[PDB]
């Protein structure tokens, strides 16, 4: 049918056709008369599943032969979403696909409805790792990715009179086509026991046992034939009343059960921490086996590469000193500087609550070589301090990995910073905060280790696979090679004032979102008007996001309506989309909040279909792929200084939203882009935030000067939005009243009138959408393989390849 | 290579061959040079189960079609062992895949050693629903095995300085793929919650819900081309601390954990209740579902058999009731009617501490409306009996299903027997001992129900798959018919005086010892004369089984060589295999025991090879199929009266050992068929041993009586199998002889003096033979595909068909 989707070849078909016949009958063991639609996505999934195991095979044994540099990326989180379509997409396989169903009288997308998310991360982070494994197989680099199956990934969002409900995400029940069980290279993992010295050194003895099996799960380039491997542990008791012997082995198993829901919070819990040693014990041994098949450590820094998504796998960098001086007997300043040559640590946040800080007993009790191990570093690091800045004892106490209180705690960043040759933030202005304030002392001890990678997204799933239309139509005037090579967009420019292309934008837009509007009336029976300008907000919810100041606007339009009734506004449906980490009280409230103003705001009859407030229920990968092309206004609102990059706003400037923000993150380098003209800048800079700290930040004064905001607090308390209870937002007042950590009356009128002039530029149709092609031309510079490419060069040492291997 | 294995085709061997690389390729994602034998298993696995899943598919069509009545096999164990070769046997595909493994540079063989056993099941009781099945299926009955597909079987045996020791048997670790998951047809059990009476009836309410997803292995017929099914359950948790909420859904999923093991021995724990519960909840709404494809329930037992295999399941009886009554509002008497005309009962032992006696406490709490419907039952029941026996208020308190004490309990057999039009026992002897006995008061009230069904083995697995030698010679002289209708080995008969089968029959025994010898030393690094008399006893160990009058012979052949060391006796190796369940104190005793006897005999230097005792470690369904056709002597000890049929012991007359036995069970039959002069009978009839009870059995008098006997049990006493414990075997000694149930003693002298002339007839190559022919020729009775036409015809009402389905 389209372009983009390759060739539907005569020869390819019959194929396609024979082969989902031969897993309907042999692997599903069903036949036509009985197969339900879930029977025939999976026959679909095992029949594409095929085509990527020749390549796979091929791909691995190539990496055997030439033995280049292996990139190793250690996260907690990969966010992978569905996997049949994105696999369709890499292999050139979709219209074949698509003509092969449809000839057996099926609809292969309401097949690729059934899949389940691989949910298995919270949201950026996670899903940063996730397109990151796209670009490295993009760009033929030898990546694994490495990280932990779990039983159940993040839950099922359910509203239940406007609240939260958590449901276990049971995502395997039916099972996973995808993976491949490895049970013969399981492992095992150490826990426990104590530290004996001998005369040949330390001895960690009388351990706990239990066993990692992994879990190899394909990961395809875009149409170059790499197949690399995504490498996930499980966890197994080991073989050794009988009954509750038996039964107490869910006990070992527990540590791969479930995905803890924090996202940008530290909880400090005794199975966390189990799961980011499993994750680096068994990541770790496989990596030195595979180093072992090609005595000699100084070459390992030129044969690996270690990146550590956040701190969660900060052991990376004891557990590496362990195996290489306890096991391996190197002294340990040699050991020492292999570590460091080989780990690199990305940080994603500067959230105080956000870091990790272990506790000291816990350590002790759980992992004692590896606290002896930290406080051997940490002596080693101090006295480097010591020796660089003397007699600067407050830098000494600061610095230290060790935080005395009365509670003592490692902090797992400073460990990072001290065993990494490598620390970078995610967009340049994270990156240059990191350097004047948290890790300023570090910095100025090692400012060489300190670089920017600004984040990234694939524009494969992003564009190619969740809006087919609009590569479409950029495909017709710029080719191909765009999807490859988004800096390619930029020849979109000079289109900006022919006609023809303005018209096509906008009818993928309105196509987009007809579609979207009739995915909410079939599955959820909610009832929006298409013509009007469609407002996201989609994100985890967390009070430095400010789904709060967009809250308040929502309000204002409203109560602008009522004073009103008969002026004009341009229609909006405003939706906000998140989950809640169960025990977030605040996040639970806000929540509930937005949905208490859907009641009141939607079945209001002077309102009309003027305006409109949803609450986007279990937002996750698969619903992202579907809003995104549907918006035409992105809502990226945090204070600045506190977003480190946001990987969304590069999701809907991509697929044709403008763009409302504050200069946070990488806001800042979008802007830059498009030119400060093409986007919606408003509110504080971050110098404006570190103004109004030093002062005192009283919102009292905003209430006292601003009729409209008093109006809307006055409302929260007096049980307008919640007349059964009266007193429910009680938390939310007082909250924005007395101790609002992210200001957000300090940026209400100057978010107010910019979202007015959005209004405005939405009535004039036309120079919209060519303020929507300046967006997309210049979104180039986001794609997740600039992001890798720099990463490659800069920090791993490593050239990409964009040549094909063969088939 | 050989006859009965098929034929190699030119054809089919280069289509399994393909077929077998495609798998290696495509479903296991491996290459030639990275393989290790168990990919090579597994693709062979996969091949053999591609040409089962035509006929499966076909097979199911078949009965939707044909609409016949419907047999349910209810069990708790399903004593499996390995699939593949079954497979191959029941297809005539082993040659040709012997053949294109071969080919490949493989050996069949060493693939087939790396299946783990589905120990599914603890001893005979197990076995016989696995014979059953393949029965059944060979004789083309629209019959479903239904089960619990537990997480763990039965536990692997270590021993350890002589001592049992369990070890989990995780026989899932790497994948069945013998089984089709069908989440599909996931079905909710009901646990706990109350009664409630309304209007218009009783109604269960507030209770916890888990999750019965089915498992579905194929069962194929000899030869026929029909594929039954066998069903098996899986608990699964609803999907409705965050975290500790997702950890605690292991406690719904633990139904299915574990098999409890104990054999013959009841024990009342929750978990096990439970276990019950779920097969029968889940396996009832299947059933009923089954037969809605096709309002009125008078039609039910026209269409529905269930047999019950013991009282594990004995819950289908108030299940069906309440499903019947509560949910589908048909009357009480009607109800009732169909369910009789619907349940059977098999009775499997009557030892009383086998016996299952639910307290009332534990039912009340878990199950309260099935409670109700038995308190129910009991009332009209005993209101038939007072009926009948007018005034006998002595048969009310026995025959009632509630037993009073100070713990109330219900006697699940008297639930089992009033719910049932049919009881039958397992052998003859054991048939009668029921009307006689425990059931004497249910008999006189209701003689039609009681009937016998003499158990039998399969001669696919227990002939042609574990002995090919044997099955090989016989189908040379007779042909290939006799292993779906083994009457015909009576044709043997006329061969007994020729000279050349004479000859055939001992070159495959000797052949058969010369492999397993080998098997002990490659394995176990154990040591063996092959050219001994192998006396081997294997099956659970129980006291009732009296492994140690085995013991005590033992002793005695040790002590009549060191007191004449130059005097010449027909060489042994006695192998004595078996499992303890974990808590049986005694049991675990009598293993230590073994070794002892084992560690001083095996290294006593005047003893030579004359004398070897062997402890054979772990045995299990797969162990069994090579020791079996090994044995020259089979040990059936049991005292009379306990042993309810045996099963074992027909696998031994079927592969050529002569049987040592007591007129115990199914002895006494095989006996009756081969001649008691070729059979070695001895000891204590029923009569006899009612005779010592009645008067007293005082062991002390054997011990006054016989010399050989005191010397024995002082060697136990004194230390003599235990110097550095002298006084480990007390408890041993003082059970012999102050409280054996068993009367161990009374038998002794009679053993001893019927195994001399075993010895005898041993040393008479020749007429030994002559022997074993007329035991082969004789053992067609004990087919279990005789046992089933006889359940089919004389319980179920169905018609067996030997015709083949076409392919
Ligand atoms: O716990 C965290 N979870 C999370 O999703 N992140 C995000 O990580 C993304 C990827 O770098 C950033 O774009 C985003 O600004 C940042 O909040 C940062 C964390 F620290
Ligand atoms: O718990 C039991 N386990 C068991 O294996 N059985 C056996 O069941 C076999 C099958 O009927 C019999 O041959 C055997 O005599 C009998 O002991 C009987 C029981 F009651």
Redesign the interface.
């Given at each position: 049918q389209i372009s983009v989707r390759g060739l539907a070849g005569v020869e390819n078909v019959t194929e396609l056709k024979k082969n989902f016949n031969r897993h309907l009958?042999?692997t599903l063991?069903?036949?036509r008369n009985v197969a339900?639609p879930?029977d025939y996505y999976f026959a679909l999934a095992h029949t594409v599943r095929?085509h990527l195991?020749?390549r796979?095979?091929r791909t691995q044994?190539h990496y055997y032969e030439k033995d280049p540099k292996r990139i190793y990326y250690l996260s907690l989180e990969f966010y992978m979403g569905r996997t049949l379509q994105n696999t369709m997409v890499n292999l050139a396989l979709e219209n074949a696909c698509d003509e092969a169903t449809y000839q057996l009288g099926l609809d292969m997308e309401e097949l690729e409805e059934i899949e389940e998310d691989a949910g298995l991360g919270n949201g950026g982070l996670g899903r940063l790792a996730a397109c990151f494994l796209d670009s490295m197989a993009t760009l033929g680099l030898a990546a694994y990715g490495y990280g932990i199956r779990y039983e159940?990934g993040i839950?099922?969002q359910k509203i239940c009179g406007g609240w939260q409900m958590?449901?276990?995400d049971?995502w395997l029940?039916?099972?996973n086509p995808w993976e491949?069980?490895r049970?013969?290279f399981t492992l095992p993992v150490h826990f426990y026991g104590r530290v004996e010295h001998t005369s040949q050194g330390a001895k960690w003895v009388d351990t706990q046992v239990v066993l990692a099996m992994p879990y190899?799960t394909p990961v395809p380039g875009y149409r170059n034939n790499v197949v690399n491997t995504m490498r996930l542990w499980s966890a197994?008791?080991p073989?050794?009343g009988?009954?509750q012997?038996?039964?107490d082995?869910?006990l070992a198993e527990?540590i791969s059960?479930?995905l803890?829901?924090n996202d940008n919070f530290f909880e400090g819990?005794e199975?966390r921490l189990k799961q980011e040693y499993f994750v680096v014990a068994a990541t770790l041994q496989d990596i030195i086996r595979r180093f072992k098949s090609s005595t000699n450590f100084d070459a390992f820094p030129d044969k690996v590469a270690i990146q550590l998504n956040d701190t969660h796998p900060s052991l990376a960098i004891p557990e590496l000193m362990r195996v290489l001086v306890d096991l391996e007997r190197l002294d340990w300043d040699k050991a020492w500087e292999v570590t460091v040559k080989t780990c690199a640590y990305t940080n994603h946040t500067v959230l105080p609550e956000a870091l990790e800080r272990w506790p000291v007993h816990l350590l002790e009790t759980l992992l004692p070589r590896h606290l002896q191990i930290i406080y051997e570093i940490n002596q080693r690091f101090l006295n480097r301090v010591a020796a660089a800045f003397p007699g600067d004892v407050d830098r000494l106490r600061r610095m230290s990995l060790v935080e005395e209180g009365a509670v003592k705690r490692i902090n797992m960043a400073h460990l990072c910073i001290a065993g990494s040759h490598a620390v970078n933030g995610v967009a340049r202005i994270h990156s240059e905060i990191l350097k004047k304030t948290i890790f300023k002392d570090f910095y100025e001890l090692e400012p060489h280790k300190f670089q920017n990678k600004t984040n990234g997204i694939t524009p494969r799933r992003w564009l190619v696979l969740c809006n087919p239309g609009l590569a479409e139509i950029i495909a017709e005037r710029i080719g191909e090679e765009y999807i490859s090579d988004l800096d390619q967009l930029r020849k979109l420019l000079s289109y900006v004032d022919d006609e023809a292309f303005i018209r096509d934008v906008a009818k993928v837009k309105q196509e987009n979102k007809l579609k979207f509007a009739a995915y909410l009336e079939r599955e959820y029976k909610v009832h929006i008007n298409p013509n009007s300008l469609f407002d996201v907000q989609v994100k985890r919810i967390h009070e430095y996001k400010r789904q709060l100041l967009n809250c308040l606007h929502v309000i204002t339009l409203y109560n602008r309506i009522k004073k009103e009734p008969n002026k004009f506004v341009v229609p909006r449906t405003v939706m906000i989309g998140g989950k809640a980490a169960?025990?977030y009280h605040m996040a639970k409230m806000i929540i509930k909040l937005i949905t208490a103003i859907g009641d009141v705001v939607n079945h209001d009859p002077v309102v009309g279909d003027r305006l409109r407030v949803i609450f986007l229920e279990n937002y996750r990968v698969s619903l992202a792929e579907k809003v995104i092309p549907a918006a035409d206004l992105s809502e990226q609102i945090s204070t600045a200084g506190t977003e480190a990059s946001g990987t969304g706003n590069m999701k809907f400037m991509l697929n044709g939203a403008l763009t409302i923000g504050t200069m946070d993150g990488a806001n800042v380098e979008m802007a830059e882009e498009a030119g400060e003209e093409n986007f919606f800048i408003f509110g504080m800079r971050v110098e404006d935030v570190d103004r109004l700290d030093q002062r005192g930040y009283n919102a009292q004064e905003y209430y006292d000067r601003i009729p409209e905001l008093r109006q809307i607090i006055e409302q929260l308390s007096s049980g307008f939005f919640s007349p059964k209870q009266p007193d429910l937002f009680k938390d939310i007042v007082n909250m924005l009243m007395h101790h609002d950590r992210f200001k957000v009356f300090a940026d209400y009128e100057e978010y107010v009138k910019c979202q007015e002039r959005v209004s405005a530029l939405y009535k004039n149709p036309r120079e919209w959408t060519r303020m929507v092609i300046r967006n997309i031309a210049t979104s180039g510079k986001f794609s997740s393989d600039r992001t890798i490419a720099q990463y490659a060069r800069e920090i791993w040492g490593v050239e990409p390849s964009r040549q094909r291997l063969p088939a």
């Amino acid at each position: 049918q389209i372009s983009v989707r390759g060739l539907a070849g005569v020869e390819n078909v019959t194929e396609l056709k024979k082969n989902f016949n031969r897993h309907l009958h042999f692997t599903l063991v069903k036949d036509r008369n009985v197969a339900t639609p879930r029977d025939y996505y999976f026959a679909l999934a095992h029949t594409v599943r095929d085509h990527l195991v020749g390549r796979w095979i091929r791909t691995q044994q190539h990496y055997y032969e030439k033995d280049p540099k292996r990139i190793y990326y250690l996260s907690l989180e990969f966010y992978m979403g569905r996997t049949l379509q994105n696999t369709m997409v890499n292999l050139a396989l979709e219209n074949a696909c698509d003509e092969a169903t449809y000839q057996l009288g099926l609809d292969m997308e309401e097949l690729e409805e059934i899949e389940e998310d691989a949910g298995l991360g919270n949201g950026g982070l996670g899903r940063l790792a996730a397109c990151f494994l796209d670009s490295m197989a993009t760009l033929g680099l030898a990546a694994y990715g490495y990280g932990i199956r779990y039983e159940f990934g993040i839950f099922n969002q359910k509203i239940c009179g406007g609240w939260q409900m958590e449901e276990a995400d049971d995502w395997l029940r039916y099972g996973n086509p995808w993976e491949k069980a490895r049970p013969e290279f399981t492992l095992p993992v150490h826990f426990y026991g104590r530290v004996e010295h001998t005369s040949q050194g330390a001895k960690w003895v009388d351990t706990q046992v239990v066993l990692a099996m992994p879990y190899d799960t394909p990961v395809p380039g875009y149409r170059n034939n790499v197949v690399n491997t995504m490498r996930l542990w499980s966890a197994k008791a080991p073989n050794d009343g009988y009954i509750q012997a038996v039964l107490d082995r869910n006990l070992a198993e527990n540590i791969s059960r479930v995905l803890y829901p924090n996202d940008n919070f530290f909880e400090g819990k005794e199975l966390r921490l189990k799961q980011e040693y499993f994750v680096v014990a068994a990541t770790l041994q496989d990596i030195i086996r595979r180093f072992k098949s090609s005595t000699n450590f100084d070459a390992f820094p030129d044969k690996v590469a270690i990146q550590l998504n956040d701190t969660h796998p900060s052991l990376a960098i004891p557990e590496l000193m362990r195996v290489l001086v306890d096991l391996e007997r190197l002294d340990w300043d040699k050991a020492w500087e292999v570590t460091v040559k080989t780990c690199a640590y990305t940080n994603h946040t500067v959230l105080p609550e956000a870091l990790e800080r272990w506790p000291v007993h816990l350590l002790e009790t759980l992992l004692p070589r590896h606290l002896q191990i930290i406080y051997e570093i940490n002596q080693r690091f101090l006295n480097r301090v010591a020796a660089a800045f003397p007699g600067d004892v407050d830098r000494l106490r600061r610095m230290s990995l060790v935080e005395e209180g009365a509670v003592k705690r490692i902090n797992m960043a400073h460990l990072c910073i001290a065993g990494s040759h490598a620390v970078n933030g995610v967009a340049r202005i994270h990156s240059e905060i990191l350097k004047k304030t948290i890790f300023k002392d570090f910095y100025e001890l090692e400012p060489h280790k300190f670089q920017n990678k600004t984040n990234g997204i694939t524009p494969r799933r992003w564009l190619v696979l969740c809006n087919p239309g609009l590569a479409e139509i950029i495909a017709e005037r710029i080719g191909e090679e765009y999807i490859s090579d988004l800096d390619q967009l930029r020849k979109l420019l000079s289109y900006v004032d022919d006609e023809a292309f303005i018209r096509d934008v906008a009818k993928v837009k309105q196509e987009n979102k007809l579609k979207f509007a009739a995915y909410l009336e079939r599955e959820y029976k909610v009832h929006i008007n298409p013509n009007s300008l469609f407002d996201v907000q989609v994100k985890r919810i967390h009070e430095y996001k400010r789904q709060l100041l967009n809250c308040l606007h929502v309000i204002t339009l409203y109560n602008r309506i009522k004073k009103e009734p008969n002026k004009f506004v341009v229609p909006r449906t405003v939706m906000i989309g998140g989950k809640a980490a169960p025990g977030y009280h605040m996040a639970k409230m806000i929540i509930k909040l937005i949905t208490a103003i859907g009641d009141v705001v939607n079945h209001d009859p002077v309102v009309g279909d003027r305006l409109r407030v949803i609450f986007l229920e279990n937002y996750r990968v698969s619903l992202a792929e579907k809003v995104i092309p549907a918006a035409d206004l992105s809502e990226q609102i945090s204070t600045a200084g506190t977003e480190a990059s946001g990987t969304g706003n590069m999701k809907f400037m991509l697929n044709g939203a403008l763009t409302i923000g504050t200069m946070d993150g990488a806001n800042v380098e979008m802007a830059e882009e498009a030119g400060e003209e093409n986007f919606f800048i408003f509110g504080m800079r971050v110098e404006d935030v570190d103004r109004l700290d030093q002062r005192g930040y009283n919102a009292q004064e905003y209430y006292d000067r601003i009729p409209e905001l008093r109006q809307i607090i006055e409302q929260l308390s007096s049980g307008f939005f919640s007349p059964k209870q009266p007193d429910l937002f009680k938390d939310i007042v007082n909250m924005l009243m007395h101790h609002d950590r992210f200001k957000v009356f300090a940026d209400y009128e100057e978010y107010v009138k910019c979202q007015e002039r959005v209004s405005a530029l939405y009535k004039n149709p036309r120079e919209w959408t060519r303020m929507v092609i300046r967006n997309i031309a210049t979104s180039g510079k986001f794609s997740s393989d600039r992001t890798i490419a720099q990463y490659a060069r800069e920090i791993w040492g490593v050239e990409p390849s964009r040549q094909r291997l063969p088939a």
